[PDB]
């Protein structure tokens, strides 16, 4: 489908301006899902496709429904895969700008992976977007250890997963416009001209 693996396939001899690492929502196919794919497209339209590596969080992250109930909102193995990818970006391309994101379970995964990441890796992540953030309430609109200016949380009116519950209703499926417009505009501001 819409998956992207450019951090895995790219050459440390041609590091890009930006690397996006994005985690999909529960039951979404591929490694980007409905929001990661247009978010990556938008960054490639702004900077050129060869100047952005788009990477989804796959492998061990199976976006299983039951893993929402685990304490941080995803599996330990899925969070560790997020960390692994952030570290691969830092090992291959330490001076590339990293931007991160997630939807739904994937926003919990991203938040936990950024919390667990080294000071070096968190410093390289210039911007993060979270859509339908399942730990919005519990993490008070932030990511632990991550400066607020680098974050945007998109929590729709009536998306109760942002309100300390795991109740999934139609507003949870409303983020496509933000993934094509406000969210990439924010990441572009953090990457720079």
Please tell me whether residue 93 adopts helix, strand or coil conformation. Answer: coil
Based on CB atoms, which residue is closest to Na ion, 10 or 75?
A: 10
Stretch that binds Na ion, among 27-35, 60-68, 140-148, 170-178 (CB under 5 A): 170-178
CB of 66 to Na ion, least distance (A): 27
Instruction: Please report whether residue 177 would count as binding Na ion according to CB under 5 A.
Output: yes
CA distance 107 to 31: 13
Stretch that binds Na ion, among 18-26, 68-76, 82-90, 173-181 (CB under 5 A): 173-181
Let me know if 79 is exposed, middle or buried by CB neighbors in 10 A (0-12, 13-18, 19+). buried
CB of 79 to Na ion, least distance (A): 25
Sheet with 52-56, side-by-side order of all strands: 52-56, 18-23, 97-103, 125-131, 151-154
Instruction: Please report whether residue 62 would count as binding Na ion according to CB under 5 A.
Output: no
Selected from 15, 49, 160, 188, the binder of Na ion by CB under 5 A is 49
Selected from 59, 174, 180, 182, the binder of Na ion by CB under 5 A is 174
Residue 145 CB partners (closer than 8 Å, separation 6+): 114, 115, 122
DSSP symbol at 172: G
Q: What does the binding site for Na ion look like in residue numbers (CB under 5 A)?
A: 6, 49, 52, 174, 177
């Amino acid at each position: 489908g819409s998956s992207k693996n450019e951090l895995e396939t790219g050459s440390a001899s041609n590091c890009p301006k930006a690397i996006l690492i994005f985690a999909r929502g529960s039951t979404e196919t591929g490694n980007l899902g409905t929001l990661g794919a247009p978010l990556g497209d938008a960054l490639e339209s702004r900077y050129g496709a060869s100047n952005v590596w788009v990477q989804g969080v796959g492998g061990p992250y199976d976006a299983a429904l039951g893993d929402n109930a685990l304490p941080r909102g995803s599996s330990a193995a899925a969070i560790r895969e997020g960390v692994r990818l952030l570290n691969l970006a830092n090992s291959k391309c330490p001076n590339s700008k990293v931007v991160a994101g997630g939807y739904s379970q994937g926003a919990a995964l991203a938040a936990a992976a950024i919390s667990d990441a080294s000071t070096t890796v968190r410093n390289q992540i210039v911007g993060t977007v979270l859509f339908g953030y399942t730990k919005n309430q519990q993490n008070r609109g932030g990511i632990p250890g991550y400066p607020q200016d680098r974050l945007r949380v998109y929590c729709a009116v009536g998306d109760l997963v942002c309100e300390g519950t795991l109740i999934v209703l139609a507003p949870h499926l409303s983020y496509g416009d933000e993934a094509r417009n406000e969210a990439p505009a924010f990441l572009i501001s953090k990457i720079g001209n």
